[PDB]
Structures are given as structure tokens and as C-alpha cells.
Homo-oligomer: A and B are copies of this chain.
Amino acid sequence: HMNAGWVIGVDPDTSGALALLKPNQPPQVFDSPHLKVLVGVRKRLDAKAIVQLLKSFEAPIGTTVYVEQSTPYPQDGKQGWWSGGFGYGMWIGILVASGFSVIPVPSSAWKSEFQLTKERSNKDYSRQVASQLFPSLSSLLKRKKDHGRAEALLIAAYGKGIKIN
């Protein structure tokens, strides 16, 4: 049956974001909190700020959350393979440990519902798509670096349409 609860979508990359769709209320989008961690320095997801961001929502138990399940290319550096596994594994861990119902979503699935093929590609037009589905947040999607916000929104609007049990 059709999901009437709260729907969250997560772009788990280190410049990713989380979108929160409540029924009958305006959509919201949040950039993922990060840290300067010395390794010199790079960005890691901030688990502590994430959990307190999730705590702030005060969502019901078992609220469904759709997490993009992404898969680096053979030519991407091993460091990026590591970071990829880290953000994904941290997001699942926090969400599962926080009582959310977690659904991984292949990148192809949500891009499929919104007709983001080679022509009119997701990188060049996903922000625009998110804008016209959620006009109230189009101010936060006016920049290239906001690609993450847009994906989180479209992952959420994808999962919203998935019938549940």
C-alpha cells in the first residue's frame, strides 16, 4: 500500500544531503554535516551532528529512509572507494541504530523515474528537475554545488512513490 508516513532521502556522499518530506507540509533539505579531519586535511561526515540533525526531526519510529546505494568506477582512486564505503556505511549505521527503516536505492532506479538519460543528463538537469517538483526550495538549488541537495530531494520523491507494507 501507498506510503502515507514520513519519507526521507539520503545522498550519502561527503558533499551530500538529506531531504525530509512530511505529508501536507513543505519539503525540507539539509546539507550533510562534515569535519576537517587530519589524514593533511579532508572532509568526513560528522556522525555526531548527523544524529543530532536526525534527533531534531523527531520523526516516528520506523520512518522509511531511502539511501542512495552508489558504486564507484574501476578507474576511481582507492581513496575514493574507501570514502564511498564510509559514508554509506555510516549512514546505514546511524539510521538503523536510530530506529529508521532503511531502503538502499540503486542510483539507476531514481534517475529512471525522472527520465534522466544520457540526453538531458542528471548532472546537468537533476537540480532543475528537483526545482520544479519542489518550487518552495528552488532558492537552495540555484548552484552547481547544490547537486547533492537535489539528489536527496529526488531520492525522497522516488521513495515516496514506492508502495510499502
Write the residues of chain A forming the contact surface with B, with a CB cutoff of 8 angstroms: 45, 47-48, 51, 54, 70, 72, 74, 76, 78-79, 81-98, 102
Contact = CB atoms under 8 A, between A and B. Distances in A.
A83 B88 CA distance: 10
A139 to B, nearest CB: 31
Given A76-B78, A97-B97, 18 more contacts: A47-B96, A48-B96, A51-B97, A72-B78, A78-B78, A81-B81, A81-B82, A82-B84, A83-B85, A86-B86, A86-B88, A90-B90, A90-B93, A92-B93, A93-B93, A93-B94, A93-B95, A94-B96
Contacts of A91: 93
A82 B83 CA distance: 7
| A interface secondary structure, majority | helix
A117 to B, nearest CB: 25
Contacts of A88: 86, 89
Contact of A93 (B78, B82, B84, B89): B89
Nearest to A46: B96
A51 B99 CA distance: 10
Contacts of A95: 93
A91 B92 CA distance: 10
Interface centre among A47, A54, A97 (most CB of B within 10 A): A97
B89 A81 contact: no
Contact of A92 (B84, B90, B96): B90
A76 B79 CA distance: 11
Contacts of A79: 81
Contact of A85 (B76, B85, B96, B102): B85
